[PDB]
Design a protein around this motif. Structure first.
Motif, PDB file in Angstrom:
ATOM      1  N   UNK A  94       6.595   8.350 -13.217  1.00 12.53           N
ATOM      2  CA  UNK A  94       6.922   8.444 -11.800  1.00 12.53           C
ATOM      3  C   UNK A  94       8.421   8.343 -11.544  1.00 12.53           C
ATOM      4  N   UNK A  95       9.185   7.803 -12.494  1.00 11.64           N
ATOM      5  CA  UNK A  95      10.627   7.674 -12.337  1.00 11.64           C
ATOM      6  C   UNK A  95      11.397   8.856 -12.909  1.00 11.64           C
ATOM      7  N   UNK A  98      12.560  15.045 -10.851  1.00  9.18           N
ATOM      8  CA  UNK A  98      11.612  15.987 -10.271  1.00  9.18           C
ATOM      9  C   UNK A  98      12.319  16.945  -9.321  1.00  9.18           C
TER      10      UNK A  98
ATOM     11  N   UNK C  10      -8.752  -4.532 -12.809  1.00  5.94           N
ATOM     12  CA  UNK C  10      -8.981  -4.458 -11.341  1.00  5.94           C
ATOM     13  C   UNK C  10      -7.816  -5.130 -10.617  1.00  5.94           C
ATOM     14  N   UNK C  15      -2.854  -4.813  -7.365  1.00  6.50           N
ATOM     15  CA  UNK C  15      -1.475  -5.248  -7.174  1.00  6.50           C
ATOM     16  C   UNK C  15      -0.536  -4.084  -6.884  1.00  6.50           C
ATOM     17  N   UNK C  16      -0.983  -2.848  -7.095  1.00  7.37           N
ATOM     18  CA  UNK C  16      -0.168  -1.660  -6.879  1.00  7.37           C
ATOM     19  C   UNK C  16      -0.838  -0.783  -5.829  1.00  7.37           C
ATOM     20  N   UNK C  52      10.202   9.680  -4.467  1.00  9.56           N
ATOM     21  CA  UNK C  52       9.305   8.562  -4.747  1.00  9.56           C
ATOM     22  C   UNK C  52      10.175   7.319  -4.884  1.00  9.56           C
ATOM     23  N   UNK C  54       9.612   3.031  -5.806  1.00  9.45           N
ATOM     24  CA  UNK C  54       8.761   1.903  -6.167  1.00  9.45           C
ATOM     25  C   UNK C  54       9.477   0.611  -5.793  1.00  9.45           C
ATOM     26  N   UNK C  61       3.254  -4.102  -4.804  1.00 10.81           N
ATOM     27  CA  UNK C  61       4.105  -3.058  -5.364  1.00 10.81           C
ATOM     28  C   UNK C  61       3.794  -1.750  -4.644  1.00 10.81           C
ATOM     29  N   UNK C  63       4.480   2.064  -3.993  1.00 15.12           N
ATOM     30  CA  UNK C  63       5.022   3.307  -4.535  1.00 15.12           C
ATOM     31  C   UNK C  63       4.994   4.329  -3.402  1.00 15.12           C
ATOM     32  N   UNK C 181     -11.916  -2.920  -2.532  1.00 13.56           N
ATOM     33  CA  UNK C 181     -11.534  -1.867  -3.459  1.00 13.56           C
ATOM     34  C   UNK C 181     -11.638  -0.515  -2.767  1.00 13.56           C
TER      35      UNK C 181
END
Ligand SMILES: Nc1nc2c(ncn2[C@@H]2O[C@H](COP(=O)(O)OP(=O)(O)OP(=O)(O)O)[C@@H](O)[C@H]2O)c(=O)[nH]1
Ligand SMILES: Nc1nc2c(ncn2[C@@H]2O[C@H](COP(=O)(O)OP(=O)(O)O)[C@@H](O)[C@H]2O)c(=O)[nH]1
Ligand SMILES: [Mg+2]
Ligand SMILES: [Mg+2]
Lengths: 1122, 431, 184
Positions: A94-95, A98, C10, C15-16, C52, C54, C61, C63, C181
């Motif tokens: 993802x880093x 692009x 899980x 966590x993301x 993108x 993060x 976290x 993204x 979930x």
């Protein structure tokens, strides 16, 4: 690990790439250094998330430069790959860049890759993933090409076309690049333009690959796996309206491919995966009209749960769960009913794992209806207790794991009121399992499920209380769960009877002996929390199990009965009441028939005979330690017998369970004699005291060894009241065995056990000053000390090794047990000479070469020296020894390690009384065979000799002691070669450099004669070499000794063995090169040439002349044939 | 047709196995494609012992790769001979163990043991007559040694009538900088003393010293240690892979070389010693080869056989020599009145003859000795166990997983008893 | 795979979180992202692709993705509708002419099969503009009230001043954490 504390090192290693890419040794070193640095975070790579970007950009500015050579680019890509295995590609990609300016630079790099270059596979792997992270660009591949008709004669190929020709070629390779080809197509065909352009072509290619490929040809299987992976990824990451049109032809081809019958686990897993990927394309995604292909998909995915491998069962369960979540609520019931069929009686245990996995997957989404509670739950209660033995192996671990998984998925599958009916059967299951389960994974798997249940729902009896104690780390040790946490859980009335029942039913009938013993020890403590239930319900149960045909079940039930009886006796002993209050007449009546029901079925033979004997002995011990009411009854006469027979058939027991059997029999005999053999308070039965003692004493002379070994400990376990007037006979009988007779030469275990028996008897009777045949008095204390010291010189050496050492061990623990006793009663008995001899013997056995006996000896010495209540009288240089071994330093000493023992033992030479023995003991280590021991002993000896080398008196006394030790062990093969090697080392080091000043010293004048008499007519090669070295080291002493050594060295040069002839000359050359004053410079160039040219390994008659010539140069008289 | 299922766990074990396979592929005559281009009838005379018979005459190895992380599993799959191995023979996880025995033996190890036993059974079922199992791993790592011991115990419980071979590798401070390598070394030894028949001790300190001094290498890496290990392994299994007058059975060989069920540790050696690239030097005679193979310098273990006692010795020669020459040499060596007497060879060596030398050499010799000097190695790590267990250093990593200090004390007592038995039998009469 | 390993996986996934940012071109989709991290906005260029980022916030976290608001870049939004835990639609308040394009874009995104499981956050950007429509007016032109199968919400903000963005992000994170979930 909180943060990356190796940033500078990694930065330097990355920067060194530009000047280590031309090296082959440094390159591998840096690679191995980068690997070991990155592997430290393999369990928690998320900590490296903040660093990823900078390291990635470093490796990128080396592979994104135009002046970068292929070799340098390949190392950067190898590093890049090392960071993608630890963090993973899904998160590390993802880093990556692009930008639209990275579409042609990355495709052009992909077009200069050597597919046949196996060394650069990481390069190709990193290339494909980069090309795939560049297919997200929100533009058409057409806008990028521009104009294709610019090159006349040959038109350029489109970017999309090149990518389609790159993916098809990499999807049939045998390296790891094929996996990178699966991630590329997933982001190439799933876009608009490519979908309209090359989707049909790729589908035809795949259908052709799966229409021509096989699971037998190697490349055919390579073509099958890649195509299936690509199809699965496309159907997973592909739109449902662009895909559903092709779902009908893909399944029709997969059905004809015949994957279930093929012999490949990966192919079947991918096939099930592709089948579940097509299955969801027909249904609509839900957020909590049924085509015909759905039925075929379900029929395939319900046959993937009975697979022979778990990798396919997990995939089948995932597919079933994903399909049930999309289908209506009507077909869900039918799917659940069909999946429940896996738990049939005819189905194997493998089918149960898949069924439980499917049930967990269904419950995770909340698809199971309430009506399916009375059934599904009824199965789980069994899956948590699945533990069978299939021949020589055991099965049931994965079943219990899946059962715990299903239990953990029921906290969100039903409401608190929907599952309110089964909180008494499921809370008991979870707890019981987390407490008694064998595997640690299952135990913690049951611990997490219970935590989730009490957290989400919170309706289990005492959820927080049971979770606080039985936490993730508390259930780590199995022993802690059976003897501690079990009682805490049983403290409540809701987890008492079920746990005891589960323990008595399955755990008692287990196949593992350690598990049975642990369950019995747990029941011992659990009986306290429920005495009535254990005495009225468990005791009949275990009593009926002692009459079972199963051997393991019988042993477990006997152990449980013994433990429950002991617990009941302990509990009753508090209120001062008899044990009969708990057990009924029928219960105490059945405890007097166990042994007569075993001996009458001949259940003491075969491999199970030893186990039955152990169980019955433990039961007899536990019954005798409780003071049961069997006095006068003939049953006692039975128990005693069963003990004797054991001591008579110890040689029949296996070599891996004879010591434990003997110890248990001795303990049972001790518990029985001090309970059922007492006539009055303080007296004993005259008939039994006589018959047992006569039988045991007459048994000591049986030529069998194990019988004597057992009867020794038997005598050493009798109480004190039974030896009030028979000690003068028992002691004599025990001492008669401690002697080494011509027939009992290799009988060492008998004496080892006799010494231990004498220790125990001396400890029990104690000291009474005046009563010889009742206790240890000043009349029978000397004989004891003489018998114990006569077993300290046991150096018997046989084909089994130095077994006598074992006896010596029994002499160190026995002699101690006696001394410490006298100091605690009549210290006057400890004579001065006896104590000095014991101390010197302990010193010698603590300066030995073996590491485990030497360590035992040092501990015994420290214990005897650190005795202050009261202080043992008559201790030579007591203060000196105490200053040499302070109590503060003894707390941390590695006596077993020669390095941490020899430098501390060599200091004992300073004391005269110890100087002799200590040296006699250290000679064996200084001349043994162990290299580390030799080095350590020599270093520690030189460290002490350096302090007394310039002292004519101290050095003289040391040499005199050494020569006295040598003379005392004259012609002794166990002390001749080691002492000779020690003398050779001491001479080579130059310790006796003071005696070499004068001529004819009293030391060498007799040392040479002793060495000559020792080596006179010797055939051993090692002894001959040691003698030659000693005679080649003794040349430093001038006078007649030098001329005699030279004559001996000339005599030895012409030996029968050519090897000795060559070694003598080789050593004489070194001796002459060392000492130059021995031979003048006028005849020195005449000796070296004769020694180098003459072949001492040729004809002896010809070498006699050269050897005789070296006698006319050295000036040595020429010997003749006598 | 006796088939032996090969296994390799851990990074070091997988690398050693791959190197040995690639080395024997050139000797048997099977190109990395998976076909046989050999021109010797003796090559295919016993190829079934380590290769399966598939369609088109393609030979497939019998190896089973296992790990807890995928990096090394990916490197071998793309290696020079990464195509002969079956794709479904690669069993791996993601997190690894973390140089922790408790995490690689009780948790992840026992979690992947199911998938590993799946392939183990799938491979064993495709054999006419299974002889035994072989495993290549190390003793200074978590995943490797942990999974090795677990798989050995499982194969012993499920197949008690099968022989077990373990080419365990002993770590060394000069090769690794990990502090918890003594603990894992002590636990694996305790497990092997209970569930093993043969244990070829391959010290990582002797190999380093050889690569540094003998080969004269400035900075030797794992590539100079793995090549030597693979060469020694190929020299050991010379009779099991080619014909021979001597009995080339594994069970009988182990019975003859395992007179004691606790002293089953064997020191392996091989002369002449070569490096990577340069291997064609000269052809040493039989006397020179016998003198070099029995030398402490050509010993894979840091212990010297001379500092002990010879219990059993097995020698295997390969090249162009007759059994008569080896017999005469071995009989004259022990002759105390001959001009070729030594003092480091017993009076009974199981000699073998072969006509297929390795690559780059015309003659080679291998030796395997059950001498008691190996006990020294058992005392080298034991000392370290005293400099950590007493201070309880890093004990929370083991006790936190499930292990008890009762397991450590038992292993220490077992090691001490083994060392004591070795030292006691070292002083036996040579009748 | 053991229950313990299944649970470790899980937790790492929960966590993301994933937040897909979309909206018409020149709506401040990049300015909000650059302001939420503390970067500079004066040196922002019109995105000609996608971005993108993060970051970490409230133990989660995030993204955050940002795709172009152009028409030729709207035919590729389907390439980012996977594993999306939340959606953030940006709307220019000062833009009164193209008020139907956004209403048409959001309607087509609401009828997406892959976006059914996410929390909608409407960021009415450019509030300090004199001719900016209030939150109530925008809540009536985008047809947000009709929505029922999505936990939507509309808050006015200004990326240049970093106002009302933190409350909106906090509400989005709370509504995402309220669930357990997500679907596959
Ligand atoms: N001779 C040799 N030793 C190696 C090699 N690789 C690793 N070692 C040694 O192996 C020991 C433990 O490392 P590994 O075997 O790689 O680790 P593992 O067994 O996979 O265990 P985990 O790291 O816990 O997953 C260390 O002492 C290394 O020095 C190799 O290729 N050759
Ligand atoms: N007045 C005002 N201008 C803004 C605001 N947010 C962004 N802009 C400006 O609007 C223009 C469009 O920004 P940009 O982020 O490139 O739009 P995007 O490319 O769709 O994300 C830029 O010049 C910004 O500085 C705001 O809250 N108020
Ligand atoms: Mg590793
Ligand atoms: Mg932008």
């Amino acid at each position: 690990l909180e943060a990356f504390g190796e940033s500078a090192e990694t930065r330097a290693l990355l920067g060194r790439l530009r000047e280590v890419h031309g090296g082959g040794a440094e390159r591998e070193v840096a690679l191995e250094r980068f690997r070991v640095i990155m592997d430290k975070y393999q369990e928690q790579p998320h900590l490296l998330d903040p660093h990823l970007e900078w390291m990635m950009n470093l490796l990128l500015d080396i592979v994104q430069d135009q002046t970068s050579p292929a070799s340098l680019v390949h190392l950067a890509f190898k590093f890049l790959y090392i960071i993608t295995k630890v963090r993973g590609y899904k998160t590390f990609l993802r880093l990556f860049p692009h930008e639209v300016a990275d579409v042609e630079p990355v495709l052009d790099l992909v077009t200069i890759q050597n597919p046949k270059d196996h060394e650069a596979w990481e390069t190709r792997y990193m290339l494909l993933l980069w090309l795939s992270v560049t297919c997200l660009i929100p533009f058409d591949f057409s806008r990028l090409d521009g104009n294709l008709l610019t090159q006349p004669g040959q038109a350029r190929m489109s970017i999309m076309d090149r990518i389609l020709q790159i993916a098809e070629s990499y999807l049939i390779v045998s390296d790891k690049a094929r996996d990178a080809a699966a991630v590329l197509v997933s982001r190439f065909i799933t876009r608009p333009d490519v979908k309209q352009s090359k989707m049909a072509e790729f589908l035809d290619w795949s259908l052709c690959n799966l229409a021509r490929s096989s699971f037998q040809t190697m490349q055919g299987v390579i073509t099958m796996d890649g195509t299936l992976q690509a199809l699965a990824q496309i159907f997973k990451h592909g739109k449902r309206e662009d895909c559903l049109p092709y779902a009908a032809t893909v399944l029709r081809c997969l059905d004809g491919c015949r994957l279930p019958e093929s012999n490949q686990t990966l192919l079947r897993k991918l096939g099930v995966k592709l089948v579940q990927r097509l299955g969801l394309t027909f249904l609509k995604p839900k957020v909590a009209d049924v085509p015909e292909g759905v039925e075929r998909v379900i029929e395939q995915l319900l046959v993937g749960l009975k697979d022979k491998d778990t990798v396919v069962r997990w995939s089948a369960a995932k597919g079933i769960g994903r399909m049930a979540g999309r289908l209506p609520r009507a077909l869900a019931d039918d799917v659940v009913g069909s999946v429940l069929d896996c738990f049939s009686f005819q189905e194997t245990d493998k089918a149960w794992h898949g069924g439980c996995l499917a049930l967990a997957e269904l419950g995770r989404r909340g698809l199971l209806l309430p009506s399916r509670l009375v059934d599904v739950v009824a199965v789980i209660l069994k899956a948590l207790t699945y533990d069978e033995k299939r021949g020589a192996c055991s099965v049931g671990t994965n079943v219990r794991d899946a059962a715990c998984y299903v239990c953990w998925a029921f906290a969100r599958a039903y409401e608190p009121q929907e599952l309110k009916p089964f909180v008494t059967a499921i809370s008991s299951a979870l707890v019981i399992a987390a407490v008694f389960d064998r595997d640690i994974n299952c135990r913690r798997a049951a611990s997490a499920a219970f935590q989730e249940n009490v957290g989400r729902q919170g309706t289990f009896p005492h959820g927080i209380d049971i979770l606080t104690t039985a936490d993730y780390f508390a259930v780590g040790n199995r022993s802690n769960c059976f003897l501690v946490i079990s009682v805490f859980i049983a403290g409540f009335p809701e987890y008492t009877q079920p746990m005891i029942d589960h323990l008595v039913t399955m755990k008692i009938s287990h196949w593992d002996g350690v598990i049975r013993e642990l369950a019995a020890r747990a029941l011992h403590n659990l009986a306290q929390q429920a005495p009535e239930f254990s005495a009225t319900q468990v005791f009949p149960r275990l009593l009926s199990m002692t009459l079972s045909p199963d051997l393991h079940m019988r042993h477990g039930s006997i152990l449980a009965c013994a433990e429950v009886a002991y617990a009941l006796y302990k509990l009753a002993a508090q209120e001062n009441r008899p044990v009969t209050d708990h057990l009924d007449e029928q219960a105490v009546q059945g405890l007097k028939q166990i042994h007569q029901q075993l001996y009458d079925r001949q259940l003491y033979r075969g491999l199970g005979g030893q186990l039955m004997r152990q169980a019955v002995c433990v039961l007899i011990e536990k019954l005798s330690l409780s003071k049961m009411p069997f006095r006068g009854d003939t049953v006692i006469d039975g128990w005693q017998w069963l003990i004797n027979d054991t001591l008579r058939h110890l040689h029949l027991i296996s070599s891996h369970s004879r010591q434990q059997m003997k110890d248990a029999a001795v303990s049972a005999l001790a518990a029985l004699c001090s309970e059922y053999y007492m006539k009055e308070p303080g007296e004993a039965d005259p008939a039994i005291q006589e018959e047992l003692i006569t039988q045991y004493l007459a048994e000591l002379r049986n030529p069998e060894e194990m019988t004597r070994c057992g009867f020794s400990l038997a005598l050493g376990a009798l109480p004190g009241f039974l030896l009030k007037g028979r000690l003068q006979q028992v002691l004599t009988g025990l001492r008669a065995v401690t002697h080494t007779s011509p027939e009992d030469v290799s009988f060492a275990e008998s004496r080892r056990d006799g010494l231990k028996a004498i220790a125990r008897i001396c400890q029990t009777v104690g000291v009474k000053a005046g009563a010889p045949d009742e206790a240890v008095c000043g009349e029978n204390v000397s004989q004891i000390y003489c018998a114990l010291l006569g077993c300290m010189d046991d150096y018997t050496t046989d084909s089994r090794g130095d077994v006598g050492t074992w006896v010596r061990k029994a002499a160190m623990t026995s002699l101690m047990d006696l001394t410490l006793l006298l100091a605690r009663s009549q210290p006057e008995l400890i004579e001065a000479h006896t104590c000095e001899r014991i101390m010197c013997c302990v010193a010698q056995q603590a300066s030995e070469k073996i590491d485990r006996f030497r360590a035992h000896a040092a501990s015994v010495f420290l214990t005897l020296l650190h005795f202050d209540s009261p202080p043992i009288p008559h201790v030579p240089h007591r203060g000196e020894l105490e200053k040499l071994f302070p109590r503060s330093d003894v707390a941390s000493v590695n006596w077993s390690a020669p390095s941490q023992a020899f430098p501390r033992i060599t200091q004992l030479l300073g004391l005269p009384t110890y100087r002799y023995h200590v040296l006699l003991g250290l000679v064996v280590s200084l001349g043994g065979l162990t290299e580390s021991t030799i080095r350590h002993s020599t270093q520690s000896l030189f460290e002490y000799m350096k302090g007394i080398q310039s002292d004519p008196q101290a050095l003289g006394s040391f040499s005199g002691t050494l020569l006295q030790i040598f003379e005392d062990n004259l012609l002794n093969e166990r002390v001749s070669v080691p002492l000779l090697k020690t003398l050779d080392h001491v001479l080579t080091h130059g310790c006796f450099d003071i005696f070499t000043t004068e001529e004819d010293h009293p030391f060498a004048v007799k040392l040479l004669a002793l060495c000559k008499k020792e080596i006179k007519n010797s055939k051993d090669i090692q002894k001959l070499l040691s003698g030659i070295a000693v005679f080649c080291e003794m040349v430093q002493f001038p006078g007649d000794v030098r001329r005699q050594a030279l004559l001996q060295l000339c005599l030895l040069l012409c030996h029968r063995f050519p090897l000795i002839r060559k070694t003598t000359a080789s050593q004489v050359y070194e001796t002459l090169l060392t000492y130059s004053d021995v031979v003048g410079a006028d005849v020195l160039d005449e000796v070296v040439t004769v020694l180098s040219d003459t072949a001492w390994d040729a004809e002896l008659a010809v070498v006699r002349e050269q050897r005789n010539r070296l006698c006319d140069l050295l000036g040595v008289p020429r010997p003749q044939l006598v | 047709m006796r088939e032996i299922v090969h296994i390799q766990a851990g990074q070091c074990g997988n690398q050693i196995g791959a190197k040995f396979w690639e080395v024997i592929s050139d000797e048997h005559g099977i190109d990395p494609t998976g076909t046989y281009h050999g021109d010797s009838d003796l090559q295919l005379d016993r190829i079934s012992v380590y290769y399966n018979e598939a369609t088109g005459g393609k030979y497939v190895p019998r190896a089973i790769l296992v790990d807890l992380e995928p990096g090394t599993m990916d490197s071998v799959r793309s290696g020079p001979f990464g195509q002969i191995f079956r794709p479904d023979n690669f069993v791996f996880g993601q997190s690894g163990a973390g140089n922790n025995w408790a995490k690689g033996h009780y948790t992840e190890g026992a979690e992947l043991v199911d998938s590993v036993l799946d392939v183990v059974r799938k491979e064993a079922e495709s054999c006419d007559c299974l002889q035994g199992f072989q495993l290549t791993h190390s003793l200074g790592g978590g995943t490797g040694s942990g999974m090795g011991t677990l798989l050995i115990s499982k194969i012993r419980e499920e197949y008690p009538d099968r022989i077990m071979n373990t080419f365990s590798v002993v770590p060394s401070p000069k090769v690794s900088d990990t502090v918890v390598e003594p603990y894992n070394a002590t636990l694996s030894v305790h497990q092997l003393v209970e569930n093993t028949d043969e244990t070829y001790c391959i010290d990582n300190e002797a190999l380093y010293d050889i690569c540094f001094r003998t080969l004269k290498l400035t900075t030797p890496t794992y590539g100079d240690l793995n090549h030597l290990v693979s060469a020694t392994m190929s020299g050991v299994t010379t009779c099991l892979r080619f014909p021979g007058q001597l009995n080339a059975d594994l069970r009988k060989l182990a019975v003859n070389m395992v007179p004691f069920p606790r002293l089953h540790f064997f020191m392996p050696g091989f002369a002449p010693l070569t490096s990577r690239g340069s291997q064609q030097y000269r052809a040493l005679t039989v006397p020179e080869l016998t003198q070099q193979v029995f030398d402490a310098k050509n010993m894979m273990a840091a212990c010297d056989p001379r500092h002990g006692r010879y219990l059993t010795v097995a020698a295997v020669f390969r090249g162009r020599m007759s059994m008569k020459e080896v017999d005469e040499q071995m009989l004259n060596v022990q002759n105390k009145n001959s001009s070729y007497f030594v003092e480091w060879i017993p009076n009974n060596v199981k000699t073998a003859v072969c006509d297929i030398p390795p690559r780059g050499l015309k003659m080679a010799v291998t030796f395997i000795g059950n001498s008691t000097a190996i006990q020294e190695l058992f005392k080298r790590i034991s000392e370290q166990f005293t400099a950590m267990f007493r201070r309880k250093a890093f004990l929370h990593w083991y006790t936190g997983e499930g292990m008890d200090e009762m397991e450590f004390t038992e292993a220490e007592s077992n090691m001490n008893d083994l060392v004591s038995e070795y030292q006691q039998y070292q002083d036996a009469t040579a009748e | 795979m053991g229950l313990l390993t299944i649970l470790k996986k899980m937790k790492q996934k929960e966590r993301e979180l994933r937040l897909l940012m979309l909206g018409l071109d020149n709506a401040g989709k990049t300015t909000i992202l650059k302001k939420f991290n503390g970067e500079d906005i004066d040196t922002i260029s019109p995105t000609l692709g996608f971005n993108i980022k993060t970051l970490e916030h409230r133990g989660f976290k995030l993204n955050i993705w940002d795709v172009g608001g152009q028409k030729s870049l709207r035919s590729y939004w389907r390439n980012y509708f996977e594993s999306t835990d939340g959606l953030i639609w940006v709307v220019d308040s000062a833009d009164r002419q193209r008020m139907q394009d956004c209403q048409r874009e959001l309607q087509s995104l609401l009828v997406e099969e892959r976006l059914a499981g996410a929390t909608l956050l409407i960021f009415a950007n450019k509030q300090d503009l004199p001719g900016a429509l209030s939150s109530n007016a925008i809540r009536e032109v985008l047809e947000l009230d009709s929505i029922r199968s999505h936990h939507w919400c509309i808050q006015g903000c200004s990326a240049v001043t970093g106002e009302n963005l933190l409350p909106g992000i906090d509400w989005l994170l709370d509504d995402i954490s309220s669930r357990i979930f997500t679907a596959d």
